Description:
It is built from ten helices and 15 strands. It is α/β, with parallel strands linked by helices. The chain has two domains: 1-194 and 222-252 and 287-304, 3-Layer(aba) Sandwich (Rossmann fold); 195-221 and 253-286 and 305-326, Alpha-Beta Complex (UDP-galactose 4-epimerase, domain 1), CATH 3.90.25.10. The strands form five sheets. Strands 3-2-1-4-5-7-12 form a seven-stranded parallel beta sheet, sandwiched between helices. Strands 6-15 form a two-stranded parallel ribbon. It is globular, with a radius of gyration of 19 Å. In the N-terminal section; belongs to the Fmt family. UDP-L-Ara4N formyltransferase subfamily.
Amino acid sequence: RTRVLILGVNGFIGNHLTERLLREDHYEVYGLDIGSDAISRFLNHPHFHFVEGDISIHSEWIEYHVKKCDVVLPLVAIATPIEYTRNPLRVFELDFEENLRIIRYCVKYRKRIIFPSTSEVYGMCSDKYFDEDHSNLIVGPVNKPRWIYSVSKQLLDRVIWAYGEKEGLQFTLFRPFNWMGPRLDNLNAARIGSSRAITQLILNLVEGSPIKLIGKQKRCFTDIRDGIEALYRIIENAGNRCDGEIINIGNPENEASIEELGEMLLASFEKHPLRHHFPPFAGFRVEHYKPSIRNAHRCLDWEPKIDMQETIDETLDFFLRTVDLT
Length: 326
C-alpha cells in the first residue's frame, strides 16, 4: 500500500488525515513528531507508525523516511500571527529553510510532495474570489514586517514550482482557509492546520476573557469534515489530476467577520450543556478574502457540504467536553 509520511502528525490535520487514510485499506501511515499525545488513539494501530523526530534537529533521520515512503506531507511551520512580528527570524528558519530541505529530499528521491501553502499568500488581492492560477498577490512595503510569513510561504511555493518545472518533482499545493472542528491545534503549536482566530475566541469564552475586536474584516471558515475530505482526495490523486496543481480548500459560503463569528460562538455557547462550568462572558473589547474553489471542483469533484451552524456547534462542543476542568 501507499506509504504516507506525515511530518508534524501530533495535531489537528495529522489526527484527522490519519483517521481518514486508516479508514481505507491501502495506506500505511508514518506520522513523525516529537510527541504523540494528540494521536495516541492511533499508536497501536497496525498501519500506523509513530516516528520520533524534529525537522529542525534531524537531517538524516528525516531524509530516510522521505526515501522510505511514497507521499510526504510537511505540516511543521509556525503559523501564529503575533510570532510573524515577534520572532520573525525563527519563523523564517523553520517555515522556510527547514521545509526547503524536505522539499529537496523529495526532489532527490523522486517522491510526491503535498505541501500546505497558505491562504495568506494572496494578501491584499482585490479579487472577490482568490484564484490560485490568476489572482495577483499583493503585500505591503518591506518595512511592514507582518508580511514576512506570507512572502516566505510564497517564495517556497515558487521554488516548488521551479523543481516541478525543471526537475520532475511531482507535487500538489493546498491552501486551507480557516479550517476548524474537533481537536484544534494548541494556539502556540508550530503545526499547520486549525484556524487560530476561532480557537482564540473559544479560548476567550472558556477563560472568561473578552473578545478583542479589530471586528471588521470578514473570513471564510471550513469544517474539517469537508476540508480533510478534500485533502484525502489530493492524496488519492485520481487520474493524477492534481499533479502540478495549486488548490484552495475552503467553503466560500461561510463568510463572517470576527464579531459575527464571535456572536455565533456565544449563541452556541449559551445553549451548551456544560455552559455552567465556564466563567460568564467577558464581552466585546474594541477587506474581502474569499477563495475560488474551481480547482477543487475540477481536480477533486469536491464541494463543501456541512452547514456553518453545524460546524460552529461541533467545534465548540468537542472543545468544551475536552477541557480539563481540574
